[PDB]
Amino acid sequence: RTLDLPIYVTRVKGNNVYCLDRECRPRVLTIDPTEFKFKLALINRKYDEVLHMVRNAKLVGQSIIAYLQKKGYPEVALHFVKDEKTRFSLALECGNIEIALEAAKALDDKNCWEKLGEVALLQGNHQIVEMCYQRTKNFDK
Amino acid sequence: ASGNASMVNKLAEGAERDGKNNVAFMSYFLQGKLDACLELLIRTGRLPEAAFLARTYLPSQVSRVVKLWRENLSKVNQKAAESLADPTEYENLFPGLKEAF
Amino acid sequence: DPVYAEAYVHVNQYDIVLDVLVVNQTSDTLQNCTLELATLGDLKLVEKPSPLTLAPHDFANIKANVKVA
């Protein structure tokens, strides 16, 4: 759940959440945990929750960086993710090469490709990789 | 242009000298020497590629080599990244029975 | 508030850039206040996305470029 100007967490009184900036700038709070559910949930692959919440950041400065940067599944990608550029970043970060494929189609930042087909190969499929390279002018290759 | 092995051995020696991977290969080939091509790869870290040769024209290093490549991959864990089989399963190597030996 | 705005700084290549989430989970493009420009250091802040609604239940990206030299 998000704060409300300065607050400090003092400690936790039950579910009816309580928060303090020091002695004012205060909360009673309907909760909304994140994480707990999550590394357990995650640990059991489970998404249902997040999803269900429809909770969806990954950036605030960043926010993918707990371990969503050091990703845990691309199932994560699925809860949230955006622009082809962003998507692309994911395409490396996850290595989401599904998103890459399209991403690629949509990339056209060469270098980007340029590494990537190999990488793609590296991960698999040269049947495809050949194409990738085909426009890439690694003709000789 | 006229062609020559002898030139090639000395040159091979040279080939070793030159410092970019690629020429040396042609040589190795040119001589006819898978072995040489493959050894060369070991130094450069040509690994995916090395596997193709090792497969195509079979010195069955595909088995040997694949394990190592896979190991790198392995280092960079994820099961898909690991990737596994030689005679049977994922690959059926010698059970496939097809065109390089 | 519903409107929750969360923000952090990203400094992406020279440019210190302001990620802002103003999320207006508001019950409407609630009216918004005011913002002011300024000379800064070897930088100057330099952008504001113009509107001042806090669109209902809605999330927004408000970008501030800063001028980094």
Curated annotation (Swiss-Prot), chain A:
The coatomer is a cytosolic protein complex that binds to dilysine motifs and reversibly associates with Golgi non-clathrin-coated vesicles, which further mediate biosynthetic protein transport from the ER, via the Golgi up to the trans Golgi network. Coatomer complex is required for budding from Golgi membranes, and is essential for the retrograde Golgi-to-ER transport of dilysine-tagged proteins. It is found in: Cytoplasm; Golgi apparatus membrane; Cytoplasmic vesicle, COPI-coated vesicle membrane. Transmembrane segments: none annotated. The modification Phosphothreonine is found at T30. It comes from Mus musculus. Oligomeric complex that consists of at least the alpha, beta, beta', gamma, delta, epsilon and zeta subunits. Interacts with SCYL1. Interacts with JAGN1. Interacts with TMEM41B. Interacts with SVEP1. Probably interacts with PEX11A. It comes from the Eukaryota. The lineage of its organism: Eukaryota, Metazoa, Chordata, Craniata, Vertebrata. This is Coatomer subunit alpha.
From Swiss-Prot, chain B:
This is Coatomer subunit beta'. The coatomer is a cytosolic protein complex that binds to dilysine motifs and reversibly associates with Golgi non-clathrin-coated vesicles, which further mediate biosynthetic protein transport from the ER, via the Golgi up to the trans Golgi network. Coatomer complex is required for budding from Golgi membranes, and is essential for the retrograde Golgi-to-ER transport of dilysine-tagged proteins. This coatomer complex protein, essential for Golgi budding and vesicular trafficking, is a selective binding protein (RACK) for protein kinase C, epsilon type. It binds to Golgi membranes in a GTP-dependent manner. It is found in: Cytoplasm, Cytosol; Golgi apparatus membrane; Cytoplasmic vesicle, COPI-coated vesicle membrane. WD repeats lie at residues 42-79. It comes from the Eukaryota. The chain holds residues 705 to 805 of 905 of the full protein. Belongs to the WD repeat COPB2 family. Oligomeric complex that consists of at least the alpha, beta, beta', gamma, delta, epsilon and zeta subunits. Probably interacts with PEX11A. Interacts with SCYL1. Interacts with JAGN1. Disruption phenotype: The knockout of the gene results in early embryonic lethality with no viable embryos recovered at 12.5 dpc.
UniProtKB/Swiss-Prot annotation, chain C:
It is found in: Cytoplasm; Golgi apparatus membrane; Cytoplasmic vesicle, COPI-coated vesicle membrane; Cell membrane. Predominantly expressed in the upper one-third of the oxyntic mucosa and in most regions of the pyloric mucosa. Ubiquitously expressed including platelet, liver, heart, spleen, lung and kidney. Brefeldin A induces dissociation from the Golgi of the beta-COP and presumably the other coatomer subunits. Oligomeric complex that consists of at least the alpha, beta, beta', gamma, delta, epsilon and zeta subunits. Interacts with CAPN8. Interacts with SCYL1 and PRKCE. Interacts with COPG1. Interacts with ARF1 (myristoylated); this interaction is required for binding of COPB1 to Golgi membranes. Interacts (via trunk domain) with ARF1 (via switch I region); the interaction is direct. Interacts with KCNK2 (via N-terminus); this interaction increases the channel-mediated whole cell currents and promotes plasma membrane expression of KCNK2. Interacts with STX17. Interacts with TMEM115. The coatomer is a cytosolic protein complex that binds to dilysine motifs and reversibly associates with Golgi non-clathrin-coated vesicles, which further mediate biosynthetic protein transport from the ER, via the Golgi up to the trans Golgi network. Coatomer complex is required for budding from Golgi membranes, and is essential for the retrograde Golgi-to-ER transport of dilysine-tagged proteins. This is Coatomer subunit beta. It comes from Mus musculus (Mouse). The lineage of its organism: Eukaryota, Metazoa, Chordata, Craniata, Vertebrata. The chain holds residues 724 to 792 of 953 of the full protein.
